[PDB]
C-alpha cells in the first residue's frame, strides 16, 4: 500500500491492486442508431465569432 509503484492502493478481503496508473485502456462502445440524428435534420450554424 505504501511501497508499490504507479501509486497502487492495496485492498483486502479479497486482496486486490486498486487504481494503478500503468499503461492505457481500450473501450469499445456500440451506440444504437436511435441515438443518432442526420446532418440535414440537425440545426446548421453560420456567422460564427469567438
Amino acid at each position: 500500500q505504501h511501497t508499490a509503484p504507479f501509486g497502487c492502493q492495496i485492498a483486502t478481503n479479497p486482496v486486490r491492486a486498486v487504481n494503478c496508473a500503468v499503461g492505457n485502456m481500450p473501450i469499445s462502445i456500440d451506440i444504437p442508431e436511435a441515438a443518432f440524428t442526420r446532418v440535414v435534420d440537425a440545426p446548421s450554424l453560420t456567422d460564427m465569432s469567438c
Binding site: 479479497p14 491492486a17 485502456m25 473501450i27 451506440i31 443518432f36 442526420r38
Partner: protein
C-alpha cells in the same frame, strides 16, 4: 455504430471523445475511470500465528 477509443489508465480524470458517424450529426461522450481493480488468483499455502 461501433466506436473504438483508447484512454489512459488514470482514475479521476474525465476524457472526451468525438463520435462522427458519416451522414449523421457528431456526438460527444465524456468518460471517467472511477476504479481499476486487479484481483490475483490466490492459493493458500499455510497460516502462521503465536504458538
Amino acid at each position: 455504430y461501433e466506436h473504438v477509443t483508447v484512454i489512459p489508465n488514470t482514475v479521476g480524470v474525465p476524457y472526451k471523445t468525438l463520435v462522427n458517424r458519416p451522414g449523421y450529426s457528431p456526438m460527444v461522450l465524456e468518460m471517467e475511470l472511477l476504479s481499476v481493480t486487479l484481483e490475483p488468483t490466490l492459493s493458500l499455502d499455510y497460516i502462521t500465528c503465536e504458538y
